[PDB]
Amino acid sequence: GLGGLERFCSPGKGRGLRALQPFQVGDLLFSCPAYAYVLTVNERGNHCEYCFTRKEGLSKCGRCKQAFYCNVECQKEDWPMHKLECSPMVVFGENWNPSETVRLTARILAKQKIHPERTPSEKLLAVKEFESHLDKLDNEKKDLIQSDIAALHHFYSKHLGFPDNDSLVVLFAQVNCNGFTIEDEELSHLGSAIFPDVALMNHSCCPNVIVTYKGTLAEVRAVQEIKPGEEVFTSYIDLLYPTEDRNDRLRDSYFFTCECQECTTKDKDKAKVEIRKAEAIRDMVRYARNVIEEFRELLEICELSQEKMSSVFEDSNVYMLHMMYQAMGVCLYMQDWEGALQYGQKIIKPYSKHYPLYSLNVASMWLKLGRLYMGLEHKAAGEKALKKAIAIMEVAHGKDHPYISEIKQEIESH
Numbered sequence: 001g002l003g004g005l006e007r008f009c010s011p012g013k014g015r016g017l018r019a020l021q022p023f024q025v026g027d028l029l030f031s032c033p034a035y036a037y038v039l040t041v042n043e044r045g046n047h048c049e050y051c052f053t054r055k056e057g058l059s060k061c062g063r064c065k066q067a068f069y070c071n072v073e074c075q076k077e078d079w080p081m082h083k084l085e086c087s088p089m090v091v092f093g094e095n096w097n098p099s100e101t102v103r104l105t106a107r108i109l110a111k112q113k114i115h116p117e118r119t120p121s122e123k124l125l126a127v128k129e130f131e132s133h134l135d136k137l138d139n140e141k142k143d144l145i146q147s148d149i150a151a152l153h154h155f156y157s158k159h160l161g162f163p164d165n166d167s168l169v170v171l172f173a174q175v176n177c178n179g180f181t182i183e184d185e186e187l188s189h190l191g192s193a194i195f196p197d198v199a200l201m202n203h204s205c206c207p208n209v210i211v212t213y214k215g216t217l218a219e220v221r222a223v224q225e226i227k228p229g230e231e232v233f234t235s236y237i238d239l240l241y242p243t244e245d246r247n248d249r250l251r252d253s254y255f256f257t258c259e260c261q262e263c264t265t266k267d268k269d270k271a272k273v274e275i276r277k278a279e280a281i282r283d284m285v286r287y288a289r290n291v292i293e294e295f296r297e298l299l300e301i302c303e304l305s306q307e308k309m310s311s312v313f314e315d316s317n318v319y320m321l322h323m324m325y326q327a328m329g330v331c332l333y334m335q336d337w338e339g340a341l342q343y344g345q346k347i348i349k350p351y352s353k354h355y356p357l358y359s360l361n362v363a364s365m366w367l368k369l370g371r372l373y374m375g376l377e378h379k380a381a382g383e384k385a386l387k388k389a390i391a392i393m394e395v396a397h398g399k400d401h402p403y404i405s406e407i408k409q410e411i412e413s414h
């Protein structure tokens with residue numbers, strides 16, 4: 001088990017995690033080593049495949065030239081998993097395209113073969129026990145799973161053979177319902193992983209813990225006081241958006257509707273959809289929500305949307321903020337640093353009011369802003385922004401987190 005915590009039956013939520021003892025803000029509840037994990041293709045060469053350390057001068061796999069490592073030991077330790085892809089990448093070349101979900105699922109299957117017994121990743125919840133919601137899958141989801149199975153068979157048969165279709169339908173469903181993305185300090189996608197004990201926690205829009213990552217290790221820290229017997233809740237989703245938007249995503253992705261305090265009262269809905277006629281507002285919300293999914297030179301789509309929404313929506317409106325954030329990202333890709341800074345400066349204050357006290361989204365925006373300032377020679381403003389990020393991260397990531405050490409070095413180097 002896990003010290004100070006227990007698995008229990010949470011009414012209407014299946015299994016959950018319950019506190020045996022109190023936890024205060026910032027306390028580490030537990031840490032969970034990844035059961036299986038994969039570095040995203042676009043981050044190859046930036047992070048070690050084995051331990052996810054971000055550093056320059058990584059060593060390259062001599063066989064495939066498409067995996068990178070801290071050293072020969074990280075390389076050796078990753079081989080049981082990397083061998084699933086090493087030769088196939090060479091053989092298939094530009095015709096190697098398994099989805100990240102397929103890549104992760106292959107690693108689960110490999111791990112099951114070499115380590116059938118319960119792992120240190122499964123102290124309270126085992127991978128084989130994962131919820132699948134099999135009976136709730138529509139044709140779209142079932143078709144996607146069949147595509148994933150076809151790709152698994154085609155790309156990974158050398159080490160995995162051709163696993164039974166029925167058993168793979170269940171497993172792919174489980175991976176979708178329980179998989180985690182690993183993100184860096186700016187919430188940029190690093191890869192995907194299975195953290196079985198972390199997956200036990202149910203969702204709230206007023207979560208009492210935040211999950212962060214230290215390489216491939218998941219860490220769970222309190223962001224509210226937790227009393228004996230209280231359920232431990234994490235957020236599955238971006239908390240910026242209004243109640244209907246949040247629950248549409250929870251229904252589609254996780255087959256539940258949230259009944260937390262934020263969802264019951266809808267307290268923050270008004271401030272999120274701040275107006276500067278009822279039918280005009282509803283038509284604008286419908287438009288904004290549709291336009292977001294369309295994105296889900298792209299600046300035009302953002303600029304036109306902002307102008308159109310400006311007629312009804314104030315600047316602090318979450319739909320306005322969303323577009324500003326997307327525009328900022330595009331400017332960051334084009335390397336229009338001044339453009340991205342202008343958007344970031346407009347985002348940060350209203351953005352910080354919509355999120356909870358400790359939010360990774362807010363910390364990451366402060367970091368982006370801080371690094372833009374530093375790059376554009378605004379060192380005083382950069383230092384202040386980076387310190388704002390650190391204040392949140394000390395609670396969420398722990399005071400001793402490598403990210404905090406790095407950010408402090410950025411303050412000292414500038």
Ligand SMILES: Cc1cn(CCN2CCN(c3ccccc3-c3cc(C#N)cc(C(=O)NCCCN4CCCC4)c3)CC2)c2ccccc12
Pocket residue numbers: 101104132133137141142144145172173174175176177178179180181182192193198199200235236237252253254
């Ligand atoms: C049965 C079924 C559900 N789907 C939909 C699933 N989709 C979302 C998940 N996807 C992933 C899949 C693998 C690994 C990670 C992810 C992933 C994506 C995002 C995002 N963007 C965010 C996160 C993340 O870490 N979210 C934070 C909370 C994670 N907790 C929640 C509970 C424990 C983990 C995790 C695949 C697509 C299907 C779709 C098709 C067929 C069946 C199904």
Ligand SMILES: Nc1ncnc2c1ncn2[C@@H]1O[C@H](CSCC[C@H](N)C(=O)O)[C@@H](O)[C@H]1O
Pocket residue numbers: 012013014015016130131133177178199200201202203204254255256257258259
């Ligand atoms: N706030 C909530 N209300 C209802 N169900 C929830 C919930 N948060 C999580 N869940 C359930 O938990 C799943 C995610 S995995 C979390 C552990 C799960 N309760 C289990 O027994 O294995 C979701 O698909 C949903 O079925």
Ligand SMILES: [Zn+2]
Pocket residue numbers: 048049050051052053069070071074
């Ligand atoms: Zn390494």
Ligand SMILES: [Zn+2]
Pocket residue numbers: 061062063064065066067082085086087
């Ligand atoms: Zn290789």
Ligand SMILES: [Zn+2]
Pocket residue numbers: 204205206258259260261262263264
């Ligand atoms: Zn909720």
Ligand SMILES: [Zn+2]
Pocket residue numbers: 206261262
């Ligand atoms: Zn609350």
